[PDB]
Curated annotation (Swiss-Prot), chain A:
Oligomer and partners: Component of the NuA4 histone acetyltransferase complex which contains the catalytic subunit KAT5/TIP60 and the subunits EP400, TRRAP/PAF400, BRD8/SMAP, EPC1, DMAP1/DNMAP1, RUVBL1/TIP49, RUVBL2, ING3, actin, ACTL6A/BAF53A, MORF4L1/MRG15, MORF4L2/MRGX, MRGBP, YEATS4/GAS41, VPS72/YL1 and MEAF6. KAT5/TIP60, EPC1, and ING3 together constitute a minimal HAT complex termed Piccolo NuA4. Component of a NuA4-related complex which contains EP400, TRRAP/PAF400, SRCAP, BRD8/SMAP, EPC1, DMAP1/DNMAP1, RUVBL1/TIP49, RUVBL2, actin, ACTL6A/BAF53A, VPS72 and YEATS4/GAS41. Interacts with TRIM27.
Known function: Component of the NuA4 histone acetyltransferase (HAT) complex, a multiprotein complex involved in transcriptional activation of select genes principally by acetylation of nucleosomal histones H4 and H2A. The NuA4 complex plays a direct role in repair of DNA double-strand breaks (DSBs) by promoting homologous recombination (HR). The NuA4 complex is also required for spermatid development by promoting acetylation of histones: histone acetylation is required for histone replacement during the transition from round to elongating spermatids.
Compartment list: Nucleus; Cytoplasm
The protein, known as: Enhancer of polycomb homolog 1
Family: Belongs to the enhancer of polycomb family.
Species name: Homo sapiens (Human)
Gene: EPC1
UniProtKB/Swiss-Prot annotation, chain B:
Keyword Nucleus: yes
Record's disease association: ACTL6A mutations have been found in patients with intellectual disability of variable severity, developmental delay, dysmorphic features and digit abnormalities. Additional features may include genitourinary and cardiac defects. The disease phenotype resembles Coffin-Siris syndrome and brachymorphism-onychodysplasia-dysphalangism syndrome.
Family under the similarity heading: Belongs to the actin family.
Subunit structure, as described in the record: Component of numerous complexes with chromatin remodeling and histone acetyltransferase activity. Component of the NuA4 histone acetyltransferase complex which contains the catalytic subunit KAT5/TIP60 and the subunits EP400, TRRAP/PAF400, BRD8/SMAP, EPC1, DMAP1/DNMAP1, RUVBL1/TIP49, RUVBL2, ING3, actin, ACTL6A/BAF53A, MORF4L1/MRG15, MORF4L2/MRGX, MRGBP, YEATS4/GAS41, VPS72/YL1 and MEAF6. The NuA4 complex interacts with MYC and the adenovirus E1A protein.
Any GO molecular function: transcription coactivator activity
PROSITE patterns tied to this protein: ACTINS_2
Protein name stated in the entry: Actin-like protein 6A
UniProtKB/Swiss-Prot annotation, chain C:
Function: Involved in transcription repression and activation. Its interaction with HDAC2 may provide a mechanism for histone deacetylation in heterochromatin following replication of DNA at late firing origins. Can also repress transcription independently of histone deacetylase activity. May specifically potentiate DAXX-mediated repression of glucocorticoid receptor-dependent transcription. Component of the NuA4 histone acetyltransferase (HAT) complex which is involved in transcriptional activation of select genes principally by acetylation of nucleosomal histones H4 and H2A.
Organism this protein belongs to: Homo sapiens
Compartments, record wording: Nucleus; Cytoplasm
Protein origin, superkingdom: Eukaryota
Oligomer status and interactors: Component of the NuA4 histone acetyltransferase complex which contains the catalytic subunit KAT5/TIP60 and the subunits EP400, TRRAP/PAF400, BRD8/SMAP, EPC1, DMAP1/DNMAP1, RUVBL1/TIP49, RUVBL2, ING3, actin, ACTL6A/BAF53A, MORF4L1/MRG15, MORF4L2/MRGX, MRGBP, YEATS4/GAS41, VPS72/YL1 and MEAF6. Component of a NuA4-related complex which contains EP400, TRRAP/PAF400, SRCAP, BRD8/SMAP, EPC1, DMAP1/DNMAP1, RUVBL1/TIP49, RUVBL2, actin, ACTL6A/BAF53A, VPS72 and YEATS4/GAS41. DMAP1 also forms a complex with DNMT1 and HDAC2.
Annotated gene: DMAP1
Ranges of residues in domain SANT: 80-130
Name of the molecule in the record: DNA methyltransferase 1-associated protein 1
From Swiss-Prot, chain D:
The species this protein was found in: Homo sapiens
Coiled-coil intervals, chain numbering: none
Transmembrane segments: none
Tissues showing expression: Ubiquitously expressed.
Family listed: Belongs to the SNF2/RAD54 helicase family. SWR1 subfamily.
Highest taxon in the source lineage: Eukaryota
Identification of the protein by name: E1A-binding protein p400
Cellular compartment(s): Nucleus
Range of the intact protein held here: 779 to 827 of 3159
Purpose: Component of the NuA4 histone acetyltransferase complex which is involved in transcriptional activation of select genes principally by acetylation of nucleosomal histones H4 and H2A. This modification may both alter nucleosome - DNA interactions and promote interaction of the modified histones with other proteins which positively regulate transcription. May be required for transcriptional activation of E2F1 and MYC target genes during cellular proliferation.
Length: 53, 404, 172, 49
């Protein structure tokens, strides 16, 4: 509800070291290198619930 | 390589900064002041010349209220920079510098002329320091607060453009803190035994008389130079003691802190109490300053109120979205926490308030240099360069045509 | 709250694929920017072969657009009544340079030398001038002024009074 | 009683002297580099942080 156009983050896991990554979004960087930026939010310390408790 | 080997320079109220473009931190820094031994003449710059004792130094600050004072000193300091640190021919390298909110067009033209003709710089640019810092925070419309060593000023910005009206040249700064330390020494009566005149600092306890040895080889210095190195000592002491009460000050509340065992160059080391918190509370309101009924200054919350009110209504929410810190004296502890408390109190909840989260020394001071490097890095900015060919064509008068 | 970066190495497992693939060279070549009319010669770390390509990044030359008058518009079509030709010219110049940020224009418009005029005064004057030019060559100052004075009144509304106003509103 | 008193107060105020801010009207505007400059600035600055 805060309305930040660019601060739209989402959950996901990784391919090889699969696990709850936390609210994260991809972003381009210098030298045309994409980088994953993992956020830090109200549930930062509890990023493992699963099944939508 | 959409970045050329450009160099960004940052000079603040307290010290002088600079470094390559796009880098994390300015490469170097050194004291804003320079020690003068009248006889070209003997210039003392950087610690090895300035703080290390010599004979007859008259240290001079070529700055004043963010103004150019000793053009020869600026040229000499630039040459000192180049040789002693960079060792390069910037004539081969574009450069740029920040500017004050109020730098005279005459002096800006003077420096532009000097740069292009003498320093043979290939390109130049200028912009206000607060704008650089606001860039550093990735912000377009906000309020900048800087407790540089000289002033404690507030200047809002909008769309990357300063509000000319918002300038506040408050006096209070690390100079004021040095005055507070001096009145503290007076009320508790400790002299200033500078380190340089102490061969050995012999063992001594709290309250113990200053026990020390002098090195006979010490040619006498001037009161200017000696007093200023003593001021450096005082600022070190402040840092060792920096703190502010987070609420309405109380003498005994502040005294409740365990008196910190701070040592002095002589080797003496007493313990300091509530004074370090009695002092700063005046920064948040000069009226309450016991003994000194400072009223001309605006208390921290008073500064906030003044700056907010003097703006217009529509953007004030935008400015409240950002609040920024800067300056050598911004080292103070309890700085931002008590700042925000005083806000929440005096600042109405009517408008949403939001600050800028940055407290490391690196950010807290060199955010401006960071913003400058940030701008230099951008690939689009290159159209905004200032080619030396254009300056050759139109004199230094091209600044007015190209810089409003 | 950090950010992993792309990794290509991982492990010493890539002996081959390089001897067949030359590293295309890079050179600190000069260049010129079209966006700089004087065409200042600067440098790029281009990959050698990418030499002479037009400056790819200077295609953003989009700017503000403001009209102009010479001798009659200021007296025939855009015939002024309150401003000087100098005042109209200065307004339009500040607009062109500032790209229509009317608050910026006003705060950087000479109120003393030119006629002292609020930001909305300049806004309405420009509205008249530009609309006259458009229609002859083919925007609500009053209501907005009323709304803005209302806004500032409400803003100045003393915080306790605002508190009881909101308490009523929620109490509904 | 609450309805009557609230009505009296909020009318004698909000008839013309309370909140009730219709809106600022809109008008068109072209655009220039500055959007691109500020976009690049934000993006790269977050990158650096």
């Amino acid at each position: 509800g805060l309305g930040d156009v660019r601060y739209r983050y989402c959950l996901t896991t990784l391919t090889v070291p699969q696990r709850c990554i936390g609210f994260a979004r991809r972003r381009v960087g210098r030298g045309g290198r994409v980088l994953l930026d993992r956020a830090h939010s109200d549930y930062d310390s509890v990023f493992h619930h699963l099944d939508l408790e | 390589g959409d970045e050329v080997g450009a160099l960004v320079f940052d000079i603040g109220s307290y010290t002088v900064r600079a470094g390559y473009a796009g880098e994390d931190c300015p490469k170097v820094d050194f004291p804003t002041a320079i020690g003068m031994v009248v006889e070209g003449p003997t210039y003392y710059i950087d610690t090895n010349a300035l703080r290390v004792p010599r004979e007859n130094m008259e240290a001079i600050s070529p700055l004043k209220n963010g103004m150019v004072e000793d053009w020869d000193s600026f040229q000499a300091i630039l040459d000192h920079t180049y040789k002693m640190h960079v060792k390069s021919e910037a004539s081969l390298h574009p450069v740029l510098m920040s500017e004050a909110p109020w730098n005279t067009r005459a002096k800006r033209e003077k420096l532009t002329e000097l740069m292009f003709e003498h320093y043979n710089i290939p390109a130049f640019f200028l912009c206000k320091t607060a704008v650089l810092t606001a860039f550093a925070n990735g912000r377009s419309t906000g309020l900048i607060l800087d407790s540089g060593a000289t002033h404690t000023t507030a200047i809002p910005v909008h769309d990357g453009y300063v509000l000319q009206q918002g300038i506040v040249k408050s006096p209070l700064a690390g100079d004021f803190i040095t005055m507070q330390c001096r009145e503290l020494f007076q009320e508790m009566n400790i002299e200033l035994v500078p380190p340089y005149m102490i061969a050995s600092k012999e063992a001594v306890r709290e309250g113990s008389p200053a026990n020390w040895k002098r090195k006979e080889k010490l040619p006498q210095v001037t009161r200017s130079w000696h007093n200023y190195m003593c001021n450096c000592v005082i600022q070190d002491f402040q840092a060792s003691v920096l703190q502010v009460s987070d609420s309405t000050y109380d003498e005994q509340v502040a005294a409740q802190m365990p008196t910190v065992h701070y040592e002095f160059p002589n080797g003496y080391n007493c313990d300091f109490g509530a004074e370090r918190l009695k002092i700063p509370e005046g920064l948040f309101d000069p009226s309450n300053v016991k003994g000194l009924s400072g009223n001309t200054m605006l208390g921290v919350s008073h500064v906030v109120t003044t700056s907010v009110g003097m703006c217009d209504i529509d953007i004030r929410p935008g400015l409240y979205g950002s609040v920024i810190v800067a300056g050598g004296n911004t080292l103070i502890q309890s700085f931002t926490d008590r700042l925000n408390r005083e806000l929440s109190q005096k600042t109405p909840p009517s408008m949403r308030l939001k600050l800028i989260a940055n407290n490391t020394t690196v950010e807290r001071r060199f955010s401006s240099w960071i913003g400058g490097s940030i701008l230099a890095s951008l690939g689009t900015f290159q159209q905004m360069w200032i080619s030396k060919q254009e300056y050759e064509e139109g004199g230094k008068q091209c600044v007015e045509r190209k810089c409003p | 709250p950090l950010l992993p970066s792309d990794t290509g190495q991982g492990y010493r497992t890539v002996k081959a694929k390089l001897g067949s693939k030359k590293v295309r060279p890079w050179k600190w070549m000069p260049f010129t920017n079209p966006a700089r009319k004087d065409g200042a010669m600067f440098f790029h770390w281009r990959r050698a072969a990418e030499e002479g390509k037009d400056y790819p990044f200077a295609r953003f030359n989009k700017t503000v657009q403001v009209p102009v008058y010479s001798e009659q518009e200021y007296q025939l079509y855009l015939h002024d009544d309150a401003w000087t030709k100098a005042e109209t010219d200065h307004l339009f110049d500040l607009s062109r340079r500032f790209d229509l940020r009317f608050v910026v224009i006003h705060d950087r418009y000479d109120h003393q030398q030119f006629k002292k005029r609020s930001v909305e005064d300049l806004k309405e004057r420009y509205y008249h001038i530009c609309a006259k030019l458009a229609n002859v060559r083919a925007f609500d100052a009053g209501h907005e002024r009323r709304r803005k004075e209302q806004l500032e009144r409400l803003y100045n509304r003393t915080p306790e009074q605002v508190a009881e106003e909101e308490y009523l509103l929620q109490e509904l | 009683n609450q309805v009557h008193q609230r009505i009296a107060e909020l009318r004698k105020a909000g008839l013309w002297s309370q909140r009730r801010l219709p809106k600022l009207q809109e008008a068109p505007r072209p655009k220039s580099h500055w959007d691109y400059l500020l976009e690049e600035m934000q993006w790269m600055a977050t990158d650096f942080a």
